[PDB]
Curated annotation (Swiss-Prot), chains A, B:
Belongs to the bacterial flagellin family. This is Flagellin. Coiled coil: none annotated. The chain holds residues 101 to 150 of 548 of the full protein. The gene is fliC. It comes from the Bacteria. It comes from Escherichia coli O127:H6 (strain E2348/69 / EPEC). Flagellin is the subunit protein which polymerizes to form the filaments of bacterial flagella.
Length: 50, 50
């Protein structure tokens, strides 16, 4: 919306930056049993047939 | 507005001085569990992860 002032648009920008940093952090930090899941493009393989 | 007399400016100055002193007070004081939160410019660090 074009009605808000830039002084208040800056706060929305800071909130957006904070949420983007959270996206980065949760993408980089979460790992299951010593192996990451969102930091690589590799494919897992689950032996299910003996 | 300039309609106020100097005597009234003295009273309003006393009031704003008291307000500023209270601001300094609440600034220096108001710790949380032994550690102050508004007297030091550093960054507090908290971890979430194993």
């Amino acid at each position: 919306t074009g009605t808000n002032s830039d002084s208040d648009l800056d706060s929305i920008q800071d909130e957006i930056k904070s949420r983007l940093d959270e996206i980065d952090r949760v993408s980089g930090q979460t790992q299951f049993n010593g192996v990451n899941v969102l930091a690589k493009d590799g494919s897992m393989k689950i032996q299910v047939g003996a």
